[PDB]
Nucleic acid binder design. Sequence first.
RNA 1: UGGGAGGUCGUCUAACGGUAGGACGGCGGACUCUUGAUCCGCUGGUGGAGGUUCGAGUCCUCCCCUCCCAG
Lengths: 249, 239
Amino acid sequence: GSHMWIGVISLFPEMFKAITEFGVTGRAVKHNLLKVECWNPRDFTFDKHKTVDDRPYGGGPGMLMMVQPLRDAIHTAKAAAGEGAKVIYLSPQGRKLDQGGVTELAQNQKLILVCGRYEGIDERLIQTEIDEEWSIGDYVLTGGELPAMTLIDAVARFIPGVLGKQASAEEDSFADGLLDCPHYTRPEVLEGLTVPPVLMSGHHEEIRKWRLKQSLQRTWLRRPELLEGLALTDEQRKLLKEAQAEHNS
Amino acid sequence: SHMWIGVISLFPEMFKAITEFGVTGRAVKHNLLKVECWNPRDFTFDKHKTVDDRPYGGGPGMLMMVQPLRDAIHTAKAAAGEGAKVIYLSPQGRKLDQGGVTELAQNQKLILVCGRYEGIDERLIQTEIDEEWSIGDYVLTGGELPAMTLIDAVARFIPGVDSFADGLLDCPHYTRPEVLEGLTVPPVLMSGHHEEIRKWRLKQSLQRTWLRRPELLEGLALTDEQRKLLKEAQAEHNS
RNA sequence: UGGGAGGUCGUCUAACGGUAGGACGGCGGACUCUUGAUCCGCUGGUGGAGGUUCGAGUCCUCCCCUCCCAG
Ligand SMILES: Nc1ncnc2c1ncn2[C@@H]1O[C@H](C[C@@H](N)CC[C@H](N)C(=O)O)[C@@H](O)[C@H]1O
Ligand SMILES: Nc1ncnc2c1ncn2[C@@H]1O[C@H](C[C@@H](N)CC[C@H](N)C(=O)O)[C@@H](O)[C@H]1O
């Protein structure tokens, strides 16, 4: 079957239950499609006080993570993963994640994700132990665990069998480089807003064209830059032109 | 002054990841942050506690059921009282950045709706949501991680607890030992002269922002000092 | 509203001139789930008149509606 192994270095491994025990990802773990193993630098501290942070040279802001426990946890994980494992550091200074980046990352059979805490980690550990740096966004969080879980989740949607029997038709934003179209479910009418008749028509071809047209229109209006480097069928061009002409004028 | 966050989620226990650990966890124990959850499942009225439903027009996937979700949001909105903004986590919403974080931070109470499956009914977005927010241009299986990400980012602004502070990437950091794998700490950081260090670190932030994320640089009004240091760094990059 | 072609459940697709079926949809139900998974019932059609024939979705006439070709 399909399997992916993700090694994680984190002071708070229990946080990862958030993805391993719940939802689609929880079932994927429960079906062995996805494996996540964690190592905690705290289990590697020679300190009698199980101390895991150290002071930054130059004084200043907060604390940095202590080098020894963190380095030892990385070497232990790296050794267990064996050969062919790419080591990633979660950091806001890293490559900003997008769907293309998710597909590329999804190209790895094994990954080790290093989650920082405090002011971050010693720059030299990054030079000597890290392969790639990735950011989940231009904002600062208190630790790398949320970013790591985010990365894991995004790639897990790409593991065959995770979403279910023939999930090729499963529609989500960016999946095909376009934003998703709007969705509707029961009731037929509530809060005075009805459902577009075409979705109730049972007319298959029109529903397909409506959905595609909605997706093009929404992408155009909210995120056109996605539109700048896209490959499209004649049908998509036509459908988009209809949409731009109609919202406009 | 503290922050209150309402959350609508089918998996409220996921939020322990932020309420029981690290800085945000400490914030919770000291009552500097409250995170209350409502689960649409507690609002169902059927034998199987159904919280999803099929989308009209057929095809694969499910959407969240309108009624339980709606009822939960109205209940949370009711508990929050006046002034609570309802935010829906979605990849089609406004992309979070440090500015968006500061604006969200102004709000005293927020309610966060976490989607699952293929999403939520469009009419709920039109009728119950004030603003839509995305954590990035990629797709997740649920809104819980994005909700926690947002909560974590804004919590940093809660009294009693910088990179992006000035629009720049952070500078590199070092701690003991002085030599690690043949790599020594830059002498300036050990010189003990606060002024030389400040200028060195600032020069590093400027250089790094330029090299990794030059676009961040376009929107800024650098001080005379910053312009000089960046100019120096660009000259060193390829002299 | 000139010259060709064509009308079957909401849509798609079958039926020798012999009891109109299937898939999807819509409604509803089980799975005993967090099932973005899979099953199971129910609903529903020959556009309309004539006529031929023991019998017509099918063949003939007319009417109507629809697509294609220059309004
Ligand atoms: N946007 C982000 N993407 C990836 N990791 C992040 C992000 N924001 C914070 N982190 C991680 O969580 C912690 C953030 C803080 N320790 C501050 C980090 C520090 N500003 C730095 O330059 O790395 C670090 O471990 C970061 O790696
Ligand atoms: N980029 C994102 N930012 C914030 N929330 C997200 C993001 N991606 C997915 N989600 C959450 O994940 C839930 C389930 C998603 N599969 C829904 C995606 C939806 N079909 C769309 O493409 O717009 C969504 O309802 C959101 O709550």
